[PDB]
Assembly symmetry: D2
Homo-oligomer: 200 residues x 4
Amino acid sequence: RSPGVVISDDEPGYDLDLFCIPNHYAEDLERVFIPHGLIMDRTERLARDVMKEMGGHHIVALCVLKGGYKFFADLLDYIKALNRNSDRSIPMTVDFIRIGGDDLSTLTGKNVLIVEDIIDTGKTMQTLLSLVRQYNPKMVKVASLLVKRTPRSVGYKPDFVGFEIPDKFVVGYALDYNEYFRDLNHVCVISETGKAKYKA
Amino acid sequence: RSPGVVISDDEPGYDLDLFCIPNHYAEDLERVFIPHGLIMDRTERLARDVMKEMGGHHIVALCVLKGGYKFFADLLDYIKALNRNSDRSIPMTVDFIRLKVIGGDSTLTGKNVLIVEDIIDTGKTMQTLLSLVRQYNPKMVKVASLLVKRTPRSVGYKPDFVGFEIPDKFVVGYALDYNEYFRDLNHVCVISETGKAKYKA
Amino acid sequence: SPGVVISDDEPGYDLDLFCIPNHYAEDLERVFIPHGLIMDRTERLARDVMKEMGGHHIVALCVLKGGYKFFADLLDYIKALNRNSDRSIPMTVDFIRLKVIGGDDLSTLTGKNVLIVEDIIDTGKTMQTLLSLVRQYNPKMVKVASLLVKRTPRSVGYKPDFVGFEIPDKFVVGYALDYNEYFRDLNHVCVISETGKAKYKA
Amino acid sequence: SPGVVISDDEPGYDLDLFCIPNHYAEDLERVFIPHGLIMDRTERLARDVMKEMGGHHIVALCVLKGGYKFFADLLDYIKALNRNSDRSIPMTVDFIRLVIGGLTGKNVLIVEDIIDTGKTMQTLLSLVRQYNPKMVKVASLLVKRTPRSVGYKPDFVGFEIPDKFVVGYALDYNEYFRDLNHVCVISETGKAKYKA
Ligand SMILES: NCCCN(CCn1cnc2c(=O)[nH]c(N)nc21)CCP(=O)(O)O
Ligand SMILES: NCCCN(CCn1cnc2c(=O)[nH]c(N)nc21)CCP(=O)(O)O
Ligand SMILES: NCCCN(CCn1cnc2c(=O)[nH]c(N)nc21)CCP(=O)(O)O
Ligand SMILES: NCCCN(CCn1cnc2c(=O)[nH]c(N)nc21)CCP(=O)(O)O
Ligand SMILES: [Mg+2]
Ligand SMILES: [Mg+2]
Ligand SMILES: [Mg+2]
Ligand SMILES: [Mg+2]
């Protein structure tokens, strides 16, 4: 339904000085695009949407490592918060994929929620949705923190979107650039003095 | 030095549907203006700034009720987080004051005083308060305000710590109110036309 | 529900097991109630309150100074419920201390669901007075939420409607509870060391 | 520091004193370790880690699945220290499932939910020693007192618990009770319903 929080092309983002930033990343980042707390507030709402739509059956929460781990944890924490303060409640099991994970035979007949960090071309998720559906789940839904407006898009749209962003390489909140920037709490844009430095 | 997070005049804010909003305010709000989480992030840095400038002597944190209570609580929580996770720290003491003055209290003498306010608009409230505080000779007076409005009506006061500098729009939430309502709202938001009419006094 | 009961011989926790402000390092003896334990109890307390007072407009009344942390945290959890359910109720806030100095005219309490938030009940005198006073303005309901309740011989016998913890007859500090204005800037509820009790004596 | 010690006669907490998920209302006996208590212990655990390993680049290795919640929180506190200190030391994240999932010349922080016999941690240690790093330390949320123990004692311990079977906070019982804030003790009805 919703395209998520839409971030425009001309969005300047925030100065790093305005926030508390992991200072081993001072000169490598351009601006802060999505502050940690903004992600949290958005994730809280997403959690309520997920429960409204899939909270009528047992849910299997599928975390796509590594970039999705932070989103996955916070999303589940907000779901768990709903489940212990409402009369409506569904049990959840958790799984982790990259390669690994449990036998996807456990997905049969269950409500599967795939949790991803970002959709670019959409190829990764199409491949994943292809492989999951061959085990006939009761329901497959996909929640992605980010969706990128890009000419290379297939045209796939996930079921839950946190943020729709421009075609710029974002890092932070578990999103990496060659395994760097994962320990950053905010989603920020990597600079050239950060790209060339951490390249390859 | 820092004017805080500058919110542009053409800032659209956020559609309500994207966030979790209290049901009884569903039709009373127009947009989410400053999301609760953004306030926390900015406040976290603000706590570090305060500790850099005032972390030398015993401080008295003065809360300007009612609107400042949320910001007061969170800012103190962030400062306390620093105090218990760092080598050197500074002991704090808390006082409360409401202005027409209804609160107390002369205890500010010789102490580092941190006044915590929700929003500076014309500057009169703070000017008055600062005169009343300087009446009793504190070692230092500092003001942290969550919001500072850009308005021609401004006398020209600028606090030492600012979270967000905003346009001349009437905001509510995060303890800020409209005729005592909307204090029970985490986000800073803009009132709808129906909302203004419903809670009009 | 008397809340979480703490026995008279509860040793508490060694300070070395938790993160405490170093400027209180030699001023405290044991951690009595960890801050996180307080939050969890407070989460359940918020649900109970809405279950009982969610019917009509709520006026939350904070008893300064000691109750500000509990008040802010209790109301945060209540707000979390209000924006995640289909049914929510408006809530206005007020601040008093500790006669009633400061605060709005108590006539505004007329007809509303009044919820009084206090840090600690000892003799019960402070609360019984305030209750009798508030009842004069004929509100639909008056309920008292208190973080702590002491088991003391001096007790008149008042029992609040919502209790976080029932504690022994020791003097505790932290979570906005003070010893001569000190220790309010402490996250955990703790007991004072004799060295600290002597340092901040009045 | 042997961590927080929970005695054998620990009655735990009555479920009615806390907020608990509906679907586990009868599957639980007592709340054993409140979520908030876990956070407070973890916060102090983070400063212990930074005291010991915070001079060099750390690689935090998460042990799936049970350790994921403790791993996330412990990292958040370390990251919080890291962006409030003056000497911000970088850290990378790795994941391993025990061997389904899965450094040389780096500092490794292994993060685990619970030490029981030590068989899991023993294997992982010998499986990490092969890659030859600089330093390896182990952080475990729980260390269970048991006669079936090899006698391994990790470098960082949150809580020392009696020989009871606890669930919650990503610790499971046949993959259930992971969606639970507090560490709790299973009810006998719960053992029967979710048996495999
Ligand atoms: N082969 C891939 C790893 C992940 N890809 C995402 C890589 N990626 C694509 N864009 C970004 C980005 O802005 N930041 C980060 N950290 N990663 C990015 C999949 C995106 P899709 O095009 O298959 O839908
Ligand atoms: N006499 C009163 C205190 C409140 N005023 C703030 C009133 N105020 C001024 N602007 C706003 C607003 O946008 N929202 C809310 N809730 N209140 C607002 C003080 C601002 P200043 O003009 O003395 O510097
Ligand atoms: N508003 C006033 C006085 C404070 N009293 C509480 C003082 N007090 C009573 N016990 C304690 C304690 O253990 N710690 C702290 N900080 N304060 C304590 C009120 C309790 P009561 O009138 O119902 O007997
Ligand atoms: N990798 C997995 C699990 C095996 N053990 C965990 C099994 N285990 C041992 N005790 C418990 C318990 O109390 N709760 C839960 N959920 N699991 C428990 C690890 C401890 P060890 O016996 O290898 O030294
Ligand atoms: Mg991915
Ligand atoms: Mg004001
Ligand atoms: Mg009191
Ligand atoms: Mg394990």
